[PDB]
Design a binder for this molecule. Structure first.
Ligand code: CLF
Ligand code: CLF
Ligand SMILES: [Cl-]
Ligand SMILES: [Cl-]
Ligand SMILES: [Fe+2]
Ligand SMILES: [Fe+2]
Lengths: 522, 477, 522, 477
């Protein structure tokens, strides 16, 4: 039943008595459901150390991964180029998923095409799909560049992208001069960040490999910046802002911030902004190239070093205080530009915030996950805040990365109770937050289900989620945030300390029971 | 817009295409004529998508894992192959259920075999057998396992049927191999059919020789309701108030036992024809169970459906039917009284999957709205046959619409509201056109039944009439 | 007792059994406490409509006010001038309070002096306090200007500031040409915002009244901006940023954003930034003067119109979409500068956010409070979002203001269930949120006690607080935020929608009970 | 620093002042000599502040309403006068209590008569009488009312005593007039005295003729503990483990009845001498109740205090004393073992109100720290007498320190940590000096007793040793 002036959606409609009774009858009649005592017994067991040991012995089963597949990253990379259509050679189901996944995170349109290979292409390969796909995409959507990646069907059947594109041009399906950079992006190798690396290196080679003769390192007096897989608009913006404030000439290579934030003014803009073809062509003439997220830009680094002859500096992601300082000092050395007064003051304002908030941050215990560079930067900043990052999970991390993080932990007493996990998923993390309970989780929206599980054990065992990472689907507009630089650190600090204080207020809100500590001033 | 204008709109839009695409797309666009009962005279459907044109379609794994199997709550569904497909589809579809997630129910979890290079090179059948044992250890209350094949499985020659039989025998467990690789078919559609045949072959016959079920004359199953935002629950309530007993829901909030009990019912009530007509025909052939199509969108269709369903039973059900209708009359009438004056005359364009593009038209009409264009991602001509009579004369029909076409048609038609999916939503909002998600219900619903109609009305109003839509133009431009 | 490895502060220490037993013994033995049943009965009664009626009949008692006293505002106004010491003539206890109040909100030093009048001054007045206080303050703290206000003792005994300052100069205690602008700021008239207006008008007069003969309206090609009482750093910043983007010459008159956000770099800076004396002296040469918060700048407006001859435009506070548009169009008209591409796109990004978030905001009901301009701008933006601002409380509001807000409510269907209250306090607001329960409160930290009270009635009656306003003492760094302009609107929208979604997640977190609606995507 | 260097420092700092202020301030600054017993040979205190110099002091209303009366939980305290004073002091001081706020307890609420011009012109006594009736209507479980006068009350000639007598008689209610206007005295201090005399005159004698309360030989009161962060609770627990009965706490978590019962006790235990010595002397004069000073900061002082208190009773209490000491020994020893090595040798400068600037020195010394400077806002010479023997030779003492002086002293002395108030905190942090609030405990505590020492140690360590302090200098110089 509904009352017309206070209509109920699913919550709380289905708590009406008539719906409750109906659901009970369905269960009892037809579902042959395990008894509630058995459900409770098994739940309790899944919270134990014994279960955790079994869980960590998994070799074949993955549950609730914290990674995606290569072509997702290729698509994001491609979106950062001016008037560029991401194009994934292979199966169309994949592209429906890539688009929707980003649509949900950015709350924006996400343009990408498929060439719709079907079962028939297993005989004969996907060459004809490429020919008609390229022609059709160019005519219909009028991109200035089509950036080609692959789905796993195309990789398994072994389609030679290079040969197919060349034949497409040979036979007149698209002009010889029309840019069609490409990369193989197998979903069964690495993760989405690998697809970003592969795509970027493919685009870099396309515009530079054959025209190296006339290039002189440093002749354009700019620094190239390669951001990697990045899903906070504030992160492209802060890096550009800081470099502009410092008077540093730069080229941000893959810059989707305009196309992922078009205005709602009565028109749809399929393309906006982005790195220009001229910038990619001229990139070898830079002083150097800086990699913002080096742990997933290894292939790009080899190309930049080996072909462009840039001496790529060994810099961590610019997250937290020390690593932002290092990034600025290196950029100052390369460019000859001094660090300006505005950035010095911004730094000191972050430090002020640290001094103001340190007493609530001190000793706070976190579980966290994400991509390798993001995770290591968050770990570093947590240590700078006097926090303990006790469970550090990077599903798509590697051994070399883990060694690097273990070293960062060793440089601080706040690292003493911390462990780094690679290859492990969110069902593994769920165990850790039961057996070695932290104060909070820092992670993406998939963490909400862990918080749910912990509250079911009891309010005293609940681990609240602080949403930082990708994807975030259950809050609005968090993709506008910043995590890099002093601005990002200021944002993360504020989010952390206020998460702490929100929880403290919840715990002290009980009239005559815990409100003795419900302080006006904190 | 007249027929000639719509015809000339189609021609204008198709001028952008190369010849081969133009000739194909012309066949998938039509101006409705409700005189027609053979849509194979007016539109082609269920063909491959043209490369490079930005179809909105998904794949057979979406149709099998995402649509049919995924909602079954007390089974574990393995996304078998590399990591992408299971991750993008994890909890994307709001197929609601009651359970203890991670313990007795598993719907919003992503179980995967996370194929690596060695699995592609040497095959994943050993991994799959090991994965099954790990599932049994860690999720002991699961009531069965399905194996949802992703693209590489068939391409590399794995034998998931052998693994399923051998492991199922060893563990006395229902383990269902589903060959729903995304290379198969042309869309979500073949995934439905594949999934239906997998239910038939591996689950549905389990209780064929079991007579213990306490059957009654009033036993029915809801076939093809995936309980989006609780839609099946707000349908079930009505059927049971009418005196029927809903033995099963396929597959929203569905359990493996209720699927196995379905061959014991007296009547299969089919909501989504496209997705579950296959198994419905199978049940009539094998068990003699009749099936009938129904529609629970809006009061006019819901009343008609209740009456048609009740007419299959006896006087006691027909009498309860009129009692139900009388009960809810003041409720939907009050919804109409409040919202119809806010929506009267407004024009809507729809683009959805296989059912809703025709099924929701009556609900719009109950609010005085007009559906001026509609179309489907993956419908067959039997769906278009059912559509031409529901749509007005000279309205626009589009099969497997391209992104370009959809934008251009909207620019000319200037609907007041669009109802489509997540990949469409933000495009049309930037154009200043109110948009409602007609898959996910924009995180609202239910929309089925009398209780759903109130929410549907609220929702179309809150969006179509929202103050934000008067603000797109800067006052200085 | 304590365990050295996990030391407990008051919460949860006093929940240990031995402390619980002790506290029970104290109560039973010595407190002669009302029985719990009687406490419960009275609590329930305080949530009723009968109680609300008695509550709203109060004429003499005020409980939990939502305003402060004049000199607080005078101090904030004064802090916005270069190398200026706020100086409150009267009783020193006042100044300890003004400083601490702002210290807690900004988490920054707040410099202000008293001249320490005592009871002895009731015979002869505070003239000698002024002479020695001015001399001492100038020598010790080296300000370039001393801006004088009053405490209520000085007002009651009738000290003539003008005469006292003049005599101080006559007798050589401070130099003749040293700037000592002043204003009478009685705590028993108006509120803190009135003190801001009084102080500003006194400073404006000091620098301009005697020098008007050489002034020509428009000759410096700038627009003066008067911010009023403002405690978000992002608000000073956004106005300066917008005007700069537009190429508009301006002078922000009273600009404390530097002195309220100095870096922690190893030195204390008593003064930083601020409006220069040169800016105040040249101000009558501007094209015009725009008042950001006109409802507490009425005295300033009379002076600017009557003496500077500026035709002050009738503009609302620039909050929300319409009023930010109006502000920019008026600034464009006055200055001759078009609204640039950057601001048009920013506007369109706000509108995009509104379209993305409208479904969760629609129909949401709010109680809210604050100063009059802030409150009316928040009401306007809530109507723009399709929200219902049902309880609108402005303790320091007036009848004319209330008529203006009632007219705003009449311009929208979303105003139909709203009432504006003036002269009412947070104990009145407490009744309203029990008897006509909204979804959320938007208010300052004193709101936390209302949320506490509502939860005590039951979880279903709890009204969560969303902290926007002044003071905010129980969260860190929210004073950095923005409420003005498109940036402010984006921030407010994001805060509101995510407050809604956080509460919905809490309500749907119950395993097998409400988690059917615990959606990953919203 | 040597004596001569500290004297030089004082002279150098005083150079900025005009002559009258210089001559005054020189009398309020001294270099400690622990041999000196008569501080009136060394330092002047409890004089007016010099105009314009940025004293840190408050007023008599702070001392009465904020400090003594405000914590009494089951009374309603009216801030009588204009709106400012009650608003700035609302919930600023963490005088903890157990109660149902708004119902039977009122501490964190702000009740005010919100004087307007008409009240100043014509007087507020009629307003006050009407306000009392409104309080009675809306807060019926209040157990008494105080009237905390703000500056204008006495200046305009209102007669709150008459209103209090008349209304108190009419309503059979204790209504206490308090003439704590901020123009009185020179600081918070006179507000304490005023407040003590108001307790004496209007509350404390209520049960002088009642013989119903059953006393025991072990009855005590905690006099002058305002329960900051729960400090009085972590004191009371120890007194009661020692076998005493704590009949009253003045005034943290205090009730009106426990104040009225205090004349029945055997011994008054005075923690804050400055604020409550007045009423303690009164109780000895009138009721014959002896009083003694004690100190619950840190294990050394707490053990000494427990022993000295137990020595006023019999052998059974002395035996329980030693049991308490033995129980807590391993707990505080573990605190010292963990934190003393992290803090050994570090130098602190304090500036606080009237007790803590000397009282916390032992707790610092229990962690190996050195208090190199200390001073008070509003202490009298009897407090300085108690301070000189607790401070080292040649340390710096400052009475009513100016902002300028405190900054300049810190720049020369370069303490490792500063302990002071909210108006000081942010100055010293920007200078790179770890700061702990020693009024509010930086929203931590308790610090009293054995359980408090653990928190105190944790807090000094977390702040002094925090990683933020190595980061103030940008690495590019
Ligand atoms: S049609 Fe899967 S998303 Fe793809 S590249 Fe392979 S992992 Fe990644 Fe359908 S079954 Fe899936 S979703 Fe595509 S792959 Fe095929
Ligand atoms: S010494 Fe009060 S803050 Fe003042 S100007 Fe009057 S309202 Fe405002 Fe002490 S009693 Fe109070 S706090 Fe001062 S006024 Fe006097
Ligand atoms: Cl889940
Ligand atoms: Cl309160
Ligand atoms: Fe958007
Ligand atoms: Fe600060």
């Amino acid at each position: 039943s509904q009352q017309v002036d206070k209509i109920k959606a699913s919550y709380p409609l289905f708590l009406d008595q008539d719906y409750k009774d109906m659901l009970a009858k369905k269960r009892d009649g037809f579902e042959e459901k395990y008894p509630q005592d058995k459900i409770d017994e098994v739940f309790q067991w899944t919270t134990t150390k014994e279960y955790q040991e079994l869980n960590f012995q998994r070799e074949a089963l993955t549950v609730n991964p914290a990674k995606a597949c290569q072509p997702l990253g290729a698509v994001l990379c491609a979106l950062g180029f001016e008037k560029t259509m991401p194009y994934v050679h292979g199966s169309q189901g994949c592209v429906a998923y890539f688009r929707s996944y980003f649509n949900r995170h950015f709350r924006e349109p996400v343009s990408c095409v498929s060439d719709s290979m079907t079962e028939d292409a297993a005989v004969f390969g996907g060459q004809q799909n490429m020919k008609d796909g390229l022609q059709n995409c160019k005519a219909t959507y009028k991109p200035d560049m089509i950036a080609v990646s692959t789905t796993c069907m195309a990789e398994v059947i072994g389609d030679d992208l290079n040969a197919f594109i060349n034949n497409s041009k040979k036979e007149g399906f698209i002009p010889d001069e029309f840019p069609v950079p490409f990369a193989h992006t197998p979903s069964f190798v690495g993760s989405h960040v690998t697809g970003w690396d592969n795509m970027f290196e493919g685009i870099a080679r396309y515009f530079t490999l054959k025209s190296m003769d006339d290039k002189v390192v440093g002749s354009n007096k700019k620094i190239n910046i390669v951001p990697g897989f990045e899903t906070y608009l504030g992160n492209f913006r802060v890096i550009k802002r800081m470099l502009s404030e410092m008077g540093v000439g730069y080229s941000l290579l893959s810059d989707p911030e305009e196309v992922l934030d078009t205005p709602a003014d009565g028109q749809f803009r399929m393309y906006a902004g982005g790195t220009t073809q001229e910038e990619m062509k001229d990139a070898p003439n830079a002083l150097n190239t800086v990699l913002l997220q080096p742990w997933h830009l290894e292939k790009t680094k080899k190309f930049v070093e080996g072909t462009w002859k840039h001496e790529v500096p060994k810099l961590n992601i610019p997250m937290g205080l020390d690593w932002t300082d290092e990034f600025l000092m290196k950029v100052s050395e390369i460019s000859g530009q001094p660090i300006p007064a505005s950035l010095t003051k911004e730094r000191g304002r972050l430090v002020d915030m640290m001094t103001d908030s340190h007493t609530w941050l001190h000793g706070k215990r976190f579980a966290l996950w994400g991509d390798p560079d993001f995770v290591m930067g968050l770990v570093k900043f947590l240590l700078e805040l006097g926090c303990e990052p006790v469970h550090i999970l990077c599903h798509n991390g590697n051994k070399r990365w883990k060694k690097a993080v273990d070293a960062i932990l060793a440089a601080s007493p706040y690292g003493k109770n911390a462990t780094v996990y690679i290859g492990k998923d969110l069902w593994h993390l769920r165990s850790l937050v039961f057996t070695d309970k932290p104060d909070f989780m820092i992670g993406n929206s998939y963490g909400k289900f862990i918080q749910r599980d912990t509250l079911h054990k009891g309010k005293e065992f609940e681990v609240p989620l602080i949403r930082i990472g990708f994807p975030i689907f259950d809050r609005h507009h968090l993709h506008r945030s910043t995590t890099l630089g002093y601005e990002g650190a200021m944002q993360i600090l504020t989010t952390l300390v206020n998460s702490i204080l929100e929880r403290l207020d919840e715990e002290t809100r009980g009239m005559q029971a815990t409100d003795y500590n419900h302080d006006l001033v904190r | 817009m007249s027929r000639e204008e719509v015809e000339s709109l189609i021609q204008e839009v198709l001028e952008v295409y190369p010849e081969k695409a133009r000739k194909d797309r012309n066949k998938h666009l039509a101006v409705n004529d409700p005189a027609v009962t053979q849509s194979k005279k007016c539109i082609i459907s269920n063909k491959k998508s043209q490369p490079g044109l930005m179809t909105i379609r998904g794949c057979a794994y979406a149709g099998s894992k995402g649509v049919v199997w995924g909602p079954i709550k007390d089974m574990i569904h393995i996304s078998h192959g590399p990591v992408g497909c299971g991750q993008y589809s994890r909890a994307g579809r709001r197929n609601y259920y009651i359970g203890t997630t991670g313990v007795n129910a598993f719907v919003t979890m992503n179980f995967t075999s996370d194929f690596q290079e060695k699995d592609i090179v040497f095959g994943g059948d050993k991994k799959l057998a090991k994965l099954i044992d790990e599932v049994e250890t860690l999720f002991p209350l699961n009531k069965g396992i399905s194996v949802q094949s992703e693209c590489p499985i068939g391409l590399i020659g794995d034998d998931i049927e052998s693994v399923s039989k051998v492991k199922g025998a060893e563990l006395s467990k229902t383990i269902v191999p589903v060959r729903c690789e995304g290379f198969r078919g042309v869309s979500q559609s073949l995934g439905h059919h594949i999934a239906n045949d997998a239910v038939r072959d591996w689950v549905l016959g389990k209780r064929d020789e079991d007579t213990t079920f306490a059957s009654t004359p009033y036993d029915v199953a809801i076939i093809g309701d995936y309980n989006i935002g609780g839609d099946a629950w707000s349908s079930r309530i009505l059927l049971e108030e009418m005196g029927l007993r809903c033995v099963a829901q396929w597959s929203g909030d569905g359990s493996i036992s209720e699927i196995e009990l379905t061959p014991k019912v007296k009547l299969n009530l089919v909501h989504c024809y496209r997705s579950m007509n296959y198994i419905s025909r199978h049940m009539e052939e094998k068990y003699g169970i009749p099936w009938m199509e129904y529609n629970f969108f809006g009061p006019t269709k819901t009343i008609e459906s209740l009456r048609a369903i009740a007419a299959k039973f006896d006087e006691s059900i027909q009498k309860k039917c009129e009692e139900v209708i009388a009960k809810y009359k003041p409720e939907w009438e009050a919804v109409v009284a409040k919202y119809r004056p806010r929506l009267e005359g407004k024009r809507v364009m729809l683009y959805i999957g296989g059912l809703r593009p025709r099924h929701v038209i009556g609900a719009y009409e109950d609010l005085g709205m007009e559906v001026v264009g509609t179309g489907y991602e993956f419908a067959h001509n039997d769906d278009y046959d059912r559509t031409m009579k529901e749509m007005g004369d000279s309205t626009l029909l589009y099969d497997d619409v391209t992104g370009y076409e959809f934008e251009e048609f909207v620019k000319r038609i200037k609907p007041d509201l669009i109802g489509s999916g997540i990949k469409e939503k933000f495009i049309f909002q930037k154009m200043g056109i109110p948009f409602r998600q007609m898959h996910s219900w924009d995180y609202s619903g239910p929309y089925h039944g009398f209780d759903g109609f109130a929410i549907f009305a609220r929702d179309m109003d809150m969006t179509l009439n929202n103050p934000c839509w008067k603000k797109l133009q800067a006052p200085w431009e």
